[PDB]
Amino acid sequence: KRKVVLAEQGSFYIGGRTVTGPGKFDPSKPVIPYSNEGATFYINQMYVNFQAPVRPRGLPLVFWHGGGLTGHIWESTPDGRPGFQTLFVQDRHTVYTIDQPGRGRGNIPTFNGPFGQLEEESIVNTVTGNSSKEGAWVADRLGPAPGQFFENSQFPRGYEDNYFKEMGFSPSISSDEIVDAVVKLVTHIGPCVLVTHSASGVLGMRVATHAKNVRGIVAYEPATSIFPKGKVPEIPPLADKKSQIFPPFEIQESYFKKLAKIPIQFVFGDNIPKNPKSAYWFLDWWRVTRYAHSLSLEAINKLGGQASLLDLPTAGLRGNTHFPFTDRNNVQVASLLSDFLGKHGLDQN
Amino acid sequence: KRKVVLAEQGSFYIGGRTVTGPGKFDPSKPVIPYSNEGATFYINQMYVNFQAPVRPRGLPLVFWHGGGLTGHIWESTPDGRPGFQTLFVQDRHTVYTIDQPGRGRGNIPTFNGPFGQLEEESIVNTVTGNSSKEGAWVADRLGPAPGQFFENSQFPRGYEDNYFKEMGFSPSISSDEIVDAVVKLVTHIGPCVLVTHSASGVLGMRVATHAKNVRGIVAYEPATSIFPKGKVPEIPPLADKKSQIFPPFEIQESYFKKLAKIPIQFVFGDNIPKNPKSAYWFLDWWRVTRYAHSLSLEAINKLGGQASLLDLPTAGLRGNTHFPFTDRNNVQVASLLSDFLGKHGLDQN
Numbered sequence A, B: 001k002r003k004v005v006l007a008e009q010g011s012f013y014i015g016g017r018t019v020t021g022p023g024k025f026d027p028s029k030p031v032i033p034y035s036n037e038g039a040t041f042y043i044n045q046m047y048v049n050f051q052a053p054v055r056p057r058g059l060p061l062v063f064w065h066g067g068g069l070t071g072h073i074w075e076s077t078p079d080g081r082p083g084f085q086t087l088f089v090q091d092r093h094t095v096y097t098i099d100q101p102g103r104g105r106g107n108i109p110t111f112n113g114p115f116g117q118l119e120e121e122s123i124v125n126t127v128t129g130n131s132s133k134e135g136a137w138v139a140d141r142l143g144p145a146p147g148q149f150f151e152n153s154q155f156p157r158g159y160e161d162n163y164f165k166e167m168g169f170s171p172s173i174s175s176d177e178i179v180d181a182v183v184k185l186v187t188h189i190g191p192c193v194l195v196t197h198s199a200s201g202v203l204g205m206r207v208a209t210h211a212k213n214v215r216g217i218v219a220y221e222p223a224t225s226i227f228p229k230g231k232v233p234e235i236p237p238l239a240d241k242k243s244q245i246f247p248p249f250e251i252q253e254s255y256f257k258k259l260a261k262i263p264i265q266f267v268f269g270d271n272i273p274k275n276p277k278s279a280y281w282f283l284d285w286w287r288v289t290r291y292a293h294s295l296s297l298e299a300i301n302k303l304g305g306q307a308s309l310l311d312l313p314t315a316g317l318r319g320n321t322h323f324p325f326t327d328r329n330n331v332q333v334a335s336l337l338s339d340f341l342g343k344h345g346l347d348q349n
Helices: A084-090 A133-139 A160-165 A175-189 A200-210 A253-261 A281-302 A330-343 B084-090 B133-139 B160-165 B175-189 B199-210 B253-261 B281-301 B330-343
Strands: A004-014 A017-020 A040-043 A046-053 A061-064 A095-099 A192-197 A214-220 A226-228 A249-251 A263-268 A306-311 B004-014 B017-020 B040-043 B046-053 B061-063 B095-099 B192-197 B214-220 B226-228 B249-251 B263-268 B306-311
Touching: A004 A084, A004 A175, A004 B160, A040 B133, A040 B160, A046 A084, A046 A175, A061 A084, A061 A175, A061 A200, A084 A095, A084 A330, A095 A175, A133 A281, A133 B040, A160 B004, A160 B040, A175 A192, A175 A200, A192 A200, A200 A214, A200 A226, A200 A249, A200 A253, A214 A330, A226 A253, A226 A281, A249 A253, A253 A281, A253 A306, A263 A281, A263 A330, A281 A306, B004 B084, B004 B175, B046 B084, B046 B175, B061 B084, B061 B175, B084 B095, B084 B330, B095 B175, B133 B281, B175 B192, B175 B199, B192 B199, B199 B214, B199 B226, B199 B249, B199 B253, B214 B330, B226 B253, B226 B281, B249 B253, B253 B281, B253 B306, B263 B281, B263 B330, B281 B306
Parallel strands: A061 A095, A061 A192, A192 A214, A214 A263, A226 A249, A263 A306, B061 B095, B061 B192, B192 B214, B214 B263, B226 B249, B263 B306
Antiparallel strands: A004 A046, A004 B004, A017 A040, A046 A095, B004 B046, B017 B040, B046 B095
């Protein structure tokens, strides 16, 4: 189960731009402490890891972590079981895992000065945001409140410390530049499949509208829905009568239509309520967000697409969290991904 | 040359602590935007990757990146050739690579507020520092000035952008907490060998004094010298007669003596001047820093140790930069590391 045979592996940086400080660099002057004088900084580049099996079959898979995460979540589960990287190299696919700009081995754009500031230019905000353990507990639907687990839970209980340690802040890099980095990667790789999660769901949809090399998308619990501009359907507020889900992203119809040309599957785990739940903000958030995605997928299919929503409980898998690919039944989740790829011939040469 | 057979691979988080915001968390209230209210944050944890071969031999190797870097530098060279991770798994060693706290997939401790600040407490400084491309060019001895190469250079020319993109800032996490994370890793792994670089040189020496499981150290161009408390020898200023090298770290003799119990090798590349070089600050810095390390190794040997300085040109390898393990001749550099492991019994069961 753990053995992996690689024809090759490695990593590289791709994407990003440069910004410069004032003046000129003099190599006779003290270089330390570091200065912005005469400086060139590489910013917003992306880290990419790849593992290729011997005799690959089908298209490479690009695994794209959710918000505040890194490629670690595809390497191993919190309790040390194989992640999707190993499972899909074993399934004969070349596997790319990324750390997007602003996360993990991706660039965090900061310089000599207050965080994110290059002289008088604010590349990213000095004030950061970051979820707590408690916020992530309910966001990820481990249970309705911190410390509590749903009855059917597939979370690897006992490995909470490992799990929450993988999470962190993201600087305010523009989503345009994150999309740009992945478009460049997709151009480098050739035809491929994007496998996204949470915050990278909407970003992967955007990449596909800019890159015909994206031949399929599987999105695990995407966080933001996407619609043609001016055609966002009515979406109710949350049960607290005041909150709303993430504002839907709107793109021109010419680009939206490109989503109708490839197979797209959204995958949802368990314990999303069917009815309003005003006592549990993030459970109710997930209810309305999943509803918005169902309308997004319908809009794609009305344009002739091949978009589907897979609720893991309807496939016989109970208790999955927001991270089905690291839950205890991740091998079964993986088999469903393999089924998707096989159905559309994305596992054939 | 690229094929790798892994009995297992994966990654995990280790070390770190928690800090807490004020108040309590209520799951009925809006969780986004994120707040420090009722918040627990995991901070200063470390990311660890491992690859184990079939039939391992000897001790596992822990590769520890230099300042502003990540485990990428052991995975691949900037031009995409195998890094030491692959080479040593092929040599039948289990290979660990880390992203230390504050770098890459390690934690960057920031919250909801100005960078590094949790309410009134500064966990890390809001003002960052970061080398420029120009500063790194001369620090790494690609050449004497930005954009210029030494004639003999082993740098993979043409891949400068890829190379500099791997570098970034580090928040002001205490070195004590970085050392603590690796001590905890070494406790978990058992007997092992540390392979360090630049800024992690002094940190690896400190880990060895706190961890008997460290059975050997190979340090590529360590940046800070270490001496027993009160016994720092005379070290000259730089050729400009104003600048100094990094202040040597001083440790109690009782701990320093532990360095005499294991084999230690410092490895230096090429183009470090023998004579004062006032026109080129970082070339002169390397001259005096290398001299300080020669005194540090001598102090270890006067306590009965086995501490050596390997200048790669004396082994017939010319032109190496500050990253010998990603230079064009990194297979030959690796061979010298395997020679060290074999001589000292570290590649036998």
